[PDB]
Amino acid sequence: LVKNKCVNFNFNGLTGTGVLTESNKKFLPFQQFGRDIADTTDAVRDPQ
Amino acid sequence: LIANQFNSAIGKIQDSLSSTASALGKLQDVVNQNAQALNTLVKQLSSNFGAISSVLNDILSRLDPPEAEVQIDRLITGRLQSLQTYVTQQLIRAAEI
Ligand SMILES: *[C@@H]1O[C@H](CO)[C@@H](O[C@@H]2O[C@H](CO)[C@@H](O[C@@H]3O[C@H](CO[C@H]4O[C@H](CO)[C@@H](O)[C@H](O)[C@@H]4O)[C@@H](O)[C@H](O)[C@@H]3O)[C@H](O)[C@H]2NC(C)=O)[C@H](O)[C@H]1NC(C)=O
Ligand SMILES: *[C@@H]1O[C@H](CO)[C@@H](O[C@@H]2O[C@H](CO)[C@@H](O)[C@H](O)[C@H]2NC(C)=O)[C@H](O)[C@H]1NC(C)=O
Numbered sequence A: 001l002v003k004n005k006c007v008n009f010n011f012n013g014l015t016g017t018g019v020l021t022e023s024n025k026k027f028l029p030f031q032q033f034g035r036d037i038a039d040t041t042d043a044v045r046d047p048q
Numbered sequence B: 001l002i003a004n005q006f007n008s009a010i011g012k013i014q015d016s017l018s019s020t021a022s023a024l025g026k027l028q029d030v031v032n033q034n035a036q037a038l039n040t041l042v043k044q045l046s047s048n049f050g051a052i053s054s055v056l057n058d059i060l061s062r063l064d065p066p067e068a069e070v071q072i073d074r075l076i077t078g079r080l081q082s083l084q085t086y087v088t089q090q091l092i093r094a095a096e097i
Helices: B002-019 B021-046 B056-062 B065-096
Strands: A006-011 A014-019
Touching: A014 B056, B021 B065, B056 B065
Parallel strands: none
Antiparallel strands: A006 A014
16 A cells, blocks of 8 residues: 555445545454544555 | 713613623524535435446545446536535525624
């Protein structure tokens, strides 16, 4: 994974385009995604 | 005497605005209405409108080109009527303002 550049990313079929940055969202285990109001992923967990 | 009454009146205006917050309901209502309209406009994106899924990349990634158009047409009609509703209500509210 390359960070801080626009990329087309595909995490477990969840696809999209955007800038991936290191995050301070302290979400507890067995949680994978985040969500905004429009219910589109805002943060994600690296599978590997 | 008139100068003293005027000064006291100004002081009372200052105290009234400092204490009572509800004085600016007329402006706060406009701000709330615009924020509410945009909130509903955004929330409309999470609706299927009949399609298999409300996110467009899942439809594009799952189904073949000859079949995607039914689901995409459903989403496009739904989102288009949502955007027209927003625009019309904004036009009316702007006329009032
Ligand atoms: C029209 O209405 C005005 C008020 O709406 C009247 O002005 C008031 O008139 C009197 C005397 O000028 C005062 O009202 C009361 O006065 C007593 C005693 O006065 C003493 O204490 C005050 C306050 O320290 C002082 O300013 C005076 O010089 C005296 O030493 C006070 O105990 C009361 O609290 C109350 O103030 C006011 O001084 C005065 N008001 C203002 C804003 O100047 C005016 O008299 C009315 N016109 C007529 C023709 O009656
Ligand atoms: C395959 O995935 C596994 C996932 O466990 C990798 O094993 C470790 O994973 C942890 C966190 O998931 C990381 O420390 C490293 O990715 C792995 N550990 C070490 C010491 O490298 C495993 O590495 C992956 N396969 C390859 C070839 O990297």
